[PDB]
Symmetry: C3
Subunit: 450 residues, 3 copies
């Protein structure tokens, strides 16, 4: 049977005190709604619909074609939001999970099991619950003698005995999709907020004698809903605790887990050392025996075995084995460093291929360029790749020596085994085994300052 | 009626184990005594006197003319210190608050209310109190049946019932100024330390049948007195907790509140994101939708809406809307960046005006200079502004292109729509719509290295 | 009497999930086994033997000649490991302590007292114990009526009354060396793990009527044994807490003790300020009144009174009084900065002597060089010290001015009171009081771009 998801992303977010949609605020460098989408899709869901409000271009921009979209004109409650998905899902069959876009810690494994538990019980609906130390204000799970849901009782309606229940509804549900949309027509908004509340469908299903199950997650933190900036930092800290503990149980040294931020899509090989203050996000793959040095930032990159990154910024880059970067270097998108390369302090690499053994040790910019194997780029050297309209390519051959403070005015090709003299501005191609020099000779005015 | 303050700043500070006056040690980048002065002045005080010891030039240097000064030759106690203010304040009328210079968390709102409570009761003296979980060693507030002060009882003198009192004297008082100086003459130093203790004036006022009130602050942390380096870090952490919570309740995202240090004079607009490790101090104004990136330091600066600062150092600078700075850039005093400017890695800007749209993308120094709108400054370019005696100005017009590794030898003016060729040292003014080139042509010695 | 130590460093370390020997993982930038060696040697030990396994070249590489080595072919337990030291120690007399290489917090003062307590009791063996809040699973110290050891009882063997004992064996022992090696011959491996357990020698000594003493350490954290990556971060945090508290009780300001990492071999003078995120390791000496600015890394260096280091990387360097470094500078090994020197942003110094008052303010590389007193090195200047085979020296005299973007092509000597014009490549020595210039003159093509 097919599986669908509705992600609720259209609320006003008044407690966030923001001009942006709440679900666009980030945890681990990604919007909350994108964490939710990743988990939903990872749970095996065939189709996702995201409920969006007015001016949702940013949300739709961010999820792209990974989700369908339904517009909620007025924010009249969670059940009304789910109703907006009718055009996409009313006549679908199978299981539909509903998840709020502000629940970024939800795991794909918990959703997989919620769905499997629902389908195997052939339930009409299944509520995801959790046990919490302080359940004040949450709907309490009241189970009947068979262990299925008797009702979710709100604080205001609970007897003193029911208030002692610690098992609470997370607000995340799985539904028989046909039943969901049939019961939504009967939900009323006869209450103080004037809102259509999604849990009301469960009481409609119960009053009709349908089966509502309960699946309890063992990780209460994963159902946390972020409503303000304090809760957003708590979600960053919960995610940090989760990922750091994962890597430390898998052979990664993390010197200071409180100050180290590793995103949920990062993989790290064993015997790697992450120093304090490091932030690693995006889809990053780090091999074994790597050192990521203090206060580095690494996004969407590949760092191979034995590499050393010291206090550097790395984006959309690849770093080969045993290569050394930094301190204070920047690898920009398309930087491709081979193995045994050196990129020293105050060096910027952009859209450039540094072949094995090449060295760019200091105070240089290498952009739109290929640097051949074992070539030494001197201090202060610049690929002049830009004319103000277009970009041009620089090619340097292997085993060459590019002197200090050299300007390579692209497009230009430097051969193999070439020496380019320090201080030269090179405009013409230089063949293999040549010396190129473009600088004035020295005039010494002796005694001029006597 | 007028209002005066005496700030006590002359103690030996033996427990600090310092060669500097205790009140000069810093919290949030400012001396403790300056935090106290700011609060006192913010409370509406007409005149401030600071009691200083020998070698106080540093204290007087720091507060300048915002305070009067009285010299305390020997450190004989708080009441003796207050006596040193006689020359300035003996014949003044009105309310006088006495605050120690080592109480940097004291808030101007608590002082405003201490003073108002004192004046509205027409009290002779009012003690600021607080409730503390562990009151051992502090003077306990013993109130009479009318709720006013009966006495402050020291631990050594208290009955077991009195020791159970959690309401303690903060050591901060408001006085009828004429009564204060009349009673100081009667305080004796007949005790083990040989010291004249300020609280003794309250018992003199009480024994004469005068009214002493009690105003209790709800924030016990604000009366903390720093006596050693451990307490100084506790005061930094208390101030951090206070300011971070303020900004997060006002629409600011702070990813890691434990590692983020925002001074008390910083204002931050909503939807701004402060990344981990950021330190913002001085009189700084940050607009809305700003990103301050990890491990940046920003002091005394203005950063407008939508700007992005990445791992950079910014001092006494202004950054316009949507401008991007860093990573690893430095803005020095007088740096003025317009809107939509780019300042890239390893760039230093000092006393320089970068007009809207200008770009300084890498490895450059711009000092004593004006860069016109949309002008592109190439990699490695330097305003040579210094001759070893004086500084000179560089002017670059709009829509110009300054090539890579160019030296602009000031004073020099570059016109509009100019191209300066890479590698050039420019000594003469360059008119609009011109090409300037100052470099040797290339000699290629083919086969030289065969 | 002589004193010996056996350090156990050959275990498989399976719970570390590592390809390296456990004792080689680091705390405060040093392998755990090196912390243990430092403490043992600091306790007065005449000879150290370290038990190593196969492929121990890295361990032997790291300790060098400060230890003897004995090879343990199969990991058959702590008593078997100690037996491997027979070749070095079997016929020695005196006291022998046995310490695991994974106990990096062990202090030399605790070992000194363990040994003195052992010798003064003329004991056969002495166990180092500690009191722990949760003793589950540890061997309990059961003392007899005279206060000496009756037995160490394992959890599995203890009565309920014995399980309530909080005093536990640390696994660190002192032995009469002749008795140790005589009893090791009788230890059997008749147990489930098939292992020879060192504590079994104590029960052999007891059954023969020998005296076994107990010395209790007051710091339970120092006997912590690191078995996994979580415990390794706990040991980093325990060491951080220990050193930070030490320096703060000795007149050092540490703004954020949770984010500041100071190694155990660092000395710091009073009134120094350590800002957040600073990491100081190796054998580092920092004088009084120093500021180490946020997110700096300093290793094996000397920083004298009043120096200021801002967000910089410093290795094997020396910095004189009142010298300013950074932000974003790098001092590499052999950098020697005199007093009142300035090293500004994006400057790299390697194997270079900067005499008093010299200034290297930005975007420069100084390597294999001497810069004389008060000499000003302009922005972009480079000592071209490398030809691709060898390194050459640059000498600059005093009170000279080296212009911006100058290349000094070593070997070259620049005299005193010299001006080198901006943009010059200098290949020939320049005498005192001279002007040197090596650059093309400017061609302005007016109207070229009209
Ligand atoms: C140019 C450089 C390579 C020459 O060093 P050198 O060979 O010891 O000095 P030489 O005088 O012998 O120069 C060799 C040739 O280049 C010529 N030449 C030298 N300087 C020249 C200049 N400014 N302009 C044009 N030709 C020049 C010389 O005339 C000589 O030519 P020839 O053999 O036909 O007579 C050296 O100054 C240099 O730049 N080293 C940089 C190392 C570096 O930057 N590493 C990173
Ligand atoms: C100098 C530069 C602008 C010229 O590129 P180009 O126009 O394609 O090459 P050209 O040979 O046609 O040079 C154009 C003119 O400058 C002249 N000229 C070129 N190089 C010269 C040099 N070293 N010295 C003096 N005059 C020179 C040429 O003779 C020509 O003059 P003309 O038209 O009177 O005959 C180019 O080399 C450059 O520096 N680009 C830098 C881009 C950058 O730095 N972005 C950041
Ligand atoms: C070269 C520099 C020092 C000269 O400035 P200046 O003295 O005001 O300008 P001048 O024209 O008077 O030059 C003085 C002498 O150098 C000569 N000279 C100037 N430029 C020259 C050049 N490219 N090539 C060869 N000789 C040159 C001049 O002919 C003059 O020589 P003369 O007295 O024999 O006639 C200046 O341009 C400079 O580089 N300042 C750098 C400051 C700095 O970098 N601080 C960090
Ligand atoms: O009408 C609604 C209400 C809520 N939602 C979505 O349901 C989830 C839970 O909704 P919340 O109650 O947590 O967020 P809110 O937008 O209502 O913020 P406040 O004003 O209460 O502070 C959120 O993700 C929200 O976007 C809708 O899509 N439509
Ligand atoms: O005689 C004094 C005593 C104290 N003070 C000021 O009163 C306030 C409280 O004085 P403290 O008792 O807290 O500081 P101290 O200087 O006496 O330091 P220790 O030797 O006790 O460690 C401090 O701010 C102090 O400067 C004086 O001005 N004069
Ligand atoms: O046979 C041994 C056992 C242990 N040791 C050394 O004794 C000390 C305590 O040994 P551990 O039990 O703590 O470490 P281990 O190597 O056995 O790691 P696990 O597989 O149990 O996870 C460690 O330092 C170890 O190196 C030996 O030298 N030889
Ligand atoms: O002496 P340094 O600074 O270590 O480095 C020197 O030799 C290196 C060899 O790899 C070169 O890459 C550098 O260009 C050069 O400055
Ligand atoms: O290719 P890059 O490194 O992104 O940047 C290039 O084009 C930019 C246009 O803004 C210029 O400012 C840079 O001088 C140039 O290097
Ligand atoms: O104006 P700035 O940037 O402060 O500094 C200027 O004068 C300094 C005097 O010390 C020189 O060292 C610098 O080379 C120069 O750029
Ligand atoms: Mg340069």
């Amino acid at each position: 049977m097919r599986r669908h998801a509705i992600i609720l992303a259209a609320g006003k977010g008044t407690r966030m005190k923001s001009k942006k949609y709440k679900v666009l605020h980030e945890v681990a460098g990604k919007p909350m709604v994108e964490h939710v989408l990743e988990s939903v899709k990872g749970s095996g869901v065939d189709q996702v619909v995201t409920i969006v409000g007015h001016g949702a271009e940013s949300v739709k921009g961010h999820l792209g074609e990974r989700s369908l979209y339904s517009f909620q004109e007025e924010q009249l409650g969670t059940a009304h939001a789910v109703q907006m998905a009718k055009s996409h899902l009313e006549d679908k069959e199978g299981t539909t999970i509903v998840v709020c876009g502000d629940t970024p810690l939800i795991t794909k494994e918990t959703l997989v099991t919620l769905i499997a538990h629902h389908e195997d019980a052939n339930a009409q609906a299944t509520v995801l619950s959790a046990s919490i130390q302080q359940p004040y204000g949450y709907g309490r799970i009241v189970r009947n003698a068979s262990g299925r849901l008797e009702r979710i009782v709100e604080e205001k309606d609970a007897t003193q005995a029911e208030k002692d229940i610690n098992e609470i509804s997370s607000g995340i549900f799985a539904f028989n999709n046909k039943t969901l949309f049939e019961k939504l027509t009967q939900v009323k908004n006869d209450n103080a907020q004037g809102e259509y509340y999604l849990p009301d469908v469960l009481s409609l299903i119960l009053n009709d004698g349908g089966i509502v199950e309960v699946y309890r997650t063992n990780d209460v933190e994963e159902i946390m809903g972020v409503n303000d900036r304090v809760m957003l930092s708590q979600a960053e800290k919960a995610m940090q605790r989760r990922t750091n503990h994962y890597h430390m149980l898998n052979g990664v040294t993390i010197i200071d887990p409180d100050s180290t931020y590793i995103g949920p899509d990062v993989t790290i090989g064993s015997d790697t050392v992450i120093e304090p203050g490091v932030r690693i996000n995006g889809r990053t793959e780090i091999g074994e025996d790597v050192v990521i040095g203090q206060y580095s930032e690494i996004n969407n990159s590949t760092i191979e075995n034995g590499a050393c990154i010291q206090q550097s910024v790395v984006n959309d880059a690849s770093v080969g084995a045993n290569t050394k970067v930094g301190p204070f270097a920047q690898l920009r998108p398309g930087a491709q460093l081979g193995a045994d390369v050196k990129v020293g302090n105050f060096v910027e690499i952009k859209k450039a291929d540094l072949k094995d053994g090449a060295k760019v040790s200091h105070l240089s910019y290498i952009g739109d360029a290929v640097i051949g194997e074992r070539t030494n780029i001197g201090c202060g050297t610049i690929t002049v790749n830009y004319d103000g309209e277009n970009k041009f390519k620089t090619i340097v051959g292997k085993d060459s020596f590019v002197g200090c403070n050299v300007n390579l005015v692209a497009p230009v090709t430097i051969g193999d085994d070439v020496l380019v003299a320090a201080g030269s501005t090179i405009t013409d191609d230089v063949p293999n085994d040549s010396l190129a020099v473009a600088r004035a000779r020295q005039t010494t005015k002796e005694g001029y300052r006597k």
